[PDB]
Short mmCIF file of C-alpha atoms and ligand atoms in Angstrom, two decimals:
data_model
loop_
_atom_site.label_atom_id
_atom_site.label_comp_id
_atom_site.label_asym_id
_atom_site.label_seq_id
_atom_site.Cartn_x
_atom_site.Cartn_y
_atom_site.Cartn_z
CA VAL A 1 97.49 128.06 91.50
CA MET A 2 95.66 131.35 90.18
CA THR A 3 96.49 134.89 91.32
CA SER A 4 93.89 137.59 91.16
CA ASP A 5 95.75 138.93 88.18
CA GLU A 6 95.53 135.75 86.27
CA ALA A 7 91.76 135.30 87.22
CA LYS A 8 90.90 139.13 86.22
CA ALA A 9 92.65 138.58 82.88
CA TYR A 10 91.12 135.29 82.15
CA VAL A 11 87.46 136.74 82.87
CA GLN A 12 88.28 139.74 80.51
CA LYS A 13 89.38 137.27 77.79
CA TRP A 14 86.10 135.76 77.72
CA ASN A 15 83.79 138.72 77.92
CA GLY A 16 81.15 138.59 75.42
CA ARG A 17 82.18 135.33 73.89
CA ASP A 18 80.39 131.73 73.64
CA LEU A 19 81.25 129.84 76.68
CA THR A 20 80.69 126.58 74.92
CA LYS A 21 84.02 127.02 73.10
CA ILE A 22 85.63 126.55 76.54
CA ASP A 23 87.76 123.19 76.79
CA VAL A 24 87.04 122.14 80.22
CA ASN A 25 90.14 119.99 80.20
CA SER A 26 92.41 123.06 79.46
CA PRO A 27 94.68 123.97 82.34
CA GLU A 28 93.35 127.55 82.50
CA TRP A 29 89.74 126.66 82.95
CA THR A 30 90.54 124.07 85.56
CA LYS A 31 92.70 126.69 87.48
CA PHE A 32 89.96 129.25 87.32
CA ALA A 33 87.12 126.84 88.39
CA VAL A 34 89.28 126.14 91.40
CA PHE A 35 90.06 129.69 92.00
CA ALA A 36 86.40 130.76 91.75
CA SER A 37 84.94 127.88 93.86
CA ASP A 38 87.36 128.25 96.66
CA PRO A 39 85.18 129.76 99.21
CA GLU A 40 87.82 132.01 100.71
CA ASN A 41 87.54 133.85 97.63
CA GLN A 42 83.73 134.11 97.51
CA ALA A 43 83.12 137.47 99.25
CA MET A 44 86.28 138.54 97.24
CA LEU A 45 84.69 137.74 93.84
CA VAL A 46 81.35 139.02 94.94
CA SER A 47 82.36 142.29 96.19
CA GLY A 48 84.97 142.37 93.60
CA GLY A 49 82.28 142.51 90.99
CA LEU A 50 83.52 139.24 88.96
CA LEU A 51 80.32 137.19 90.11
CA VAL A 52 78.16 139.21 87.59
CA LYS A 53 80.08 137.46 84.92
CA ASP A 54 78.64 134.51 82.98
CA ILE A 55 81.85 132.40 82.92
CA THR A 56 82.25 132.95 86.72
CA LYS A 57 78.85 131.71 87.35
CA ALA A 58 79.51 128.91 85.01
CA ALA A 59 82.80 128.11 86.94
CA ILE A 60 81.04 127.77 90.33
CA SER A 61 78.00 125.72 89.12
CA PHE A 62 80.61 123.42 87.19
CA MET A 63 82.43 122.84 90.58
CA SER A 64 79.08 122.22 92.38
CA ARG A 65 77.96 119.33 89.73
CA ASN A 66 77.45 115.84 90.75
CA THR A 67 80.65 113.93 89.58
CA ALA A 68 79.97 110.63 91.22
CA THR A 69 81.11 107.87 88.87
CA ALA A 70 78.51 105.66 90.22
CA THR A 71 75.37 105.29 92.39
CA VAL A 72 74.87 101.92 94.57
CA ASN A 73 72.17 100.91 96.93
CA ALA A 74 73.65 100.40 100.52
CA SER A 75 71.40 97.66 100.88
CA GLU A 76 72.72 95.52 98.41
CA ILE A 77 76.42 95.73 99.35
CA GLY A 78 75.68 95.18 103.08
CA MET A 79 76.41 98.95 104.11
CA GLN A 80 74.81 101.54 106.43
CA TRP A 81 75.84 105.19 106.99
CA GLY A 82 76.41 106.45 110.46
CA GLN A 83 76.12 103.01 112.34
CA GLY A 84 79.77 102.58 113.11
CA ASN A 85 82.60 101.53 110.98
CA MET A 86 81.73 97.88 110.73
CA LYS A 87 78.46 98.61 108.89
CA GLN A 88 80.07 101.68 106.91
CA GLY A 89 83.88 101.53 105.92
CA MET A 90 84.41 97.69 106.20
CA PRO A 91 81.61 96.70 103.78
CA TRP A 92 82.66 99.59 101.43
CA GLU A 93 86.25 98.21 101.37
CA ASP A 94 84.84 94.59 100.70
CA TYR A 95 82.68 95.88 97.90
CA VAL A 96 85.54 97.71 96.34
CA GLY A 97 87.62 94.30 96.62
CA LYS A 98 84.99 92.41 94.42
CA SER A 99 85.63 94.74 91.73
CA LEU A 100 89.40 94.67 91.85
CA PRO A 101 91.78 91.70 91.00
CA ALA A 102 91.61 88.53 93.32
CA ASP A 103 95.48 89.36 93.98
CA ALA A 104 94.92 92.79 94.97
CA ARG A 105 93.95 93.04 98.54
CA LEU A 106 96.71 94.23 101.21
CA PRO A 107 97.10 92.89 104.62
CA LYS A 108 94.96 94.39 107.14
CA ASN A 109 97.71 96.68 108.94
CA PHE A 110 99.31 97.57 105.69
CA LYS A 111 100.13 101.53 105.79
CA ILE A 112 97.87 103.83 103.78
CA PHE A 113 96.92 101.48 100.51
CA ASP A 114 94.36 98.80 100.81
CA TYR A 115 94.75 97.38 97.16
CA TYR A 116 97.48 96.94 94.79
CA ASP A 117 97.35 95.56 91.35
CA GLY A 118 100.84 94.94 89.82
CA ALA A 119 99.42 94.39 86.28
CA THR A 120 98.73 98.10 86.13
CA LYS A 121 100.89 99.34 88.98
CA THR A 122 98.02 100.68 90.68
CA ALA A 123 97.81 101.33 94.44
CA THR A 124 94.50 102.12 95.74
CA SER A 125 93.22 103.58 98.99
CA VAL A 126 89.67 103.07 100.16
CA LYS A 127 87.67 105.59 102.09
CA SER A 128 84.23 106.56 103.26
CA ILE A 129 82.84 109.90 104.45
CA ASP A 130 79.59 110.41 105.97
CA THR A 131 78.54 113.80 104.76
CA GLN A 132 75.38 113.98 106.68
CA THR A 133 76.72 114.21 110.26
CA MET A 134 75.80 117.59 111.98
CA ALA A 135 79.62 118.44 111.84
CA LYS A 136 80.07 117.89 108.08
CA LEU A 137 76.71 119.71 107.08
CA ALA A 138 77.43 122.74 109.21
CA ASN A 139 81.02 123.12 108.89
CA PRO A 140 82.72 124.44 105.54
CA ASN A 141 85.97 122.92 104.59
CA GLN A 142 85.81 119.60 106.56
CA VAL A 143 84.75 117.33 103.70
CA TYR A 144 87.65 118.98 101.72
CA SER A 145 90.32 118.60 104.29
CA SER A 146 89.29 115.04 105.07
CA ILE A 147 89.77 114.05 101.57
CA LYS A 148 92.99 116.23 101.30
CA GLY A 149 94.39 114.23 104.18
CA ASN A 150 93.74 111.11 102.33
CA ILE A 151 95.47 112.55 99.14
CA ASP A 152 98.59 113.72 100.71
CA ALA A 153 98.95 110.26 102.65
CA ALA A 154 98.70 108.61 99.34
CA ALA A 155 101.16 110.92 97.55
CA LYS A 156 103.57 110.81 100.40
CA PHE A 157 103.81 107.03 100.39
CA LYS A 158 107.47 105.76 99.59
CA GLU A 159 107.80 102.35 100.86
CA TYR A 160 106.17 99.98 103.47
CA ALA A 161 107.30 96.37 104.27
CA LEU A 162 105.29 94.35 106.60
CA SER A 163 105.81 90.87 107.58
CA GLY A 164 107.36 89.40 104.36
CA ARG A 165 105.47 91.70 102.06
CA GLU A 166 106.74 94.99 100.54
CA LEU A 167 105.56 97.67 98.14
CA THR A 168 107.87 100.63 96.98
CA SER A 169 106.73 103.68 95.10
CA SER A 170 109.21 102.91 92.28
CA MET A 171 106.46 100.31 91.58
CA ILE A 172 103.41 102.78 91.71
CA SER A 173 102.37 104.48 88.50
CA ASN A 174 98.79 105.08 89.71
CA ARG A 175 97.59 106.36 93.05
CA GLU A 176 93.97 106.18 93.43
CA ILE A 177 91.33 106.78 96.16
CA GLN A 178 87.90 104.93 96.11
CA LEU A 179 85.68 107.14 98.08
CA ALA A 180 82.11 106.41 99.00
CA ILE A 181 79.63 109.31 100.17
CA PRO A 182 75.86 109.29 100.79
CA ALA A 183 73.67 110.37 97.99
CA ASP A 184 72.10 113.18 99.98
CA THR A 185 75.39 115.02 99.72
CA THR A 186 74.75 118.79 99.47
CA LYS A 187 75.58 121.16 96.54
CA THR A 188 78.00 122.95 98.77
CA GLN A 189 79.54 119.70 99.61
CA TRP A 190 79.86 118.81 95.95
CA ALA A 191 82.14 122.24 95.44
CA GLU A 192 84.23 120.80 98.27
CA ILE A 193 84.63 117.37 96.90
CA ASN A 194 85.26 118.54 93.41
CA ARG A 195 87.94 120.93 94.59
CA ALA A 196 89.50 118.03 96.58
CA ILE A 197 89.51 115.96 93.32
CA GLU A 198 91.19 118.67 91.27
CA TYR A 199 93.95 118.89 94.03
CA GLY A 200 94.21 115.11 93.96
CA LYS A 201 95.18 115.51 90.26
CA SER A 202 97.90 117.98 90.91
CA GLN A 203 99.45 115.37 93.58
CA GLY A 204 99.11 112.64 90.93
CA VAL A 205 96.15 110.95 92.88
CA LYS A 206 92.86 109.92 91.31
CA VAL A 207 89.83 110.31 93.61
CA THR A 208 86.94 108.37 92.23
CA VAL A 209 83.66 108.82 94.10
CA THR A 210 80.63 106.42 94.27
CA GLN A 211 77.50 107.52 95.88
CA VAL A 212 75.80 105.04 98.14
CA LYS A 213 72.20 105.80 98.89
CL1 CL B 301 107.04 105.66 103.44
ZN1 ZN B 302 91.82 98.86 105.37
#
């Protein structure tokens, strides 16, 4: 996690340089982008004078970009937003199921994960978040914390054995979350989503996002 010292020195280093030379997979860019988009640092960076710098502006817009891996029509996977779990979460979960191996689906009450593929040692949790509720639209950091909770759950998992079937963490190499969001998700919500995704990486959890319109 980036300290003010580190952020200040990083900004100084990039003054008057071409920003296209920035490796957006480098650990330092990643840390700075997280630092600079975390809104508990906004007034800090603004009134501190770091926001006038191109790299700081570039970090913010980078974290606000749409990082959805796919876009799917709700009407084609039997899904609706905001009409209750049966028409939202469950069709989402079945749709993910059709794209994973035929052996992968875990029993209904299995804890935390929904799918597991032994061929790749990949355990998958399936989630949907309606970003268009009055709460999520008007309350900063709720989208973030919701995804964070899912991430920590997935990383916390050690072992679950239910009615003759068990999965242990020694057999989980990849932890993934397949997250669905509505396509009218806002720029500010995308910042939260990307911060959550990056936090996912540090916990060894891959968060993949599909926009459902
Ligand atoms: Cl456990
Ligand atoms: Zn489930």
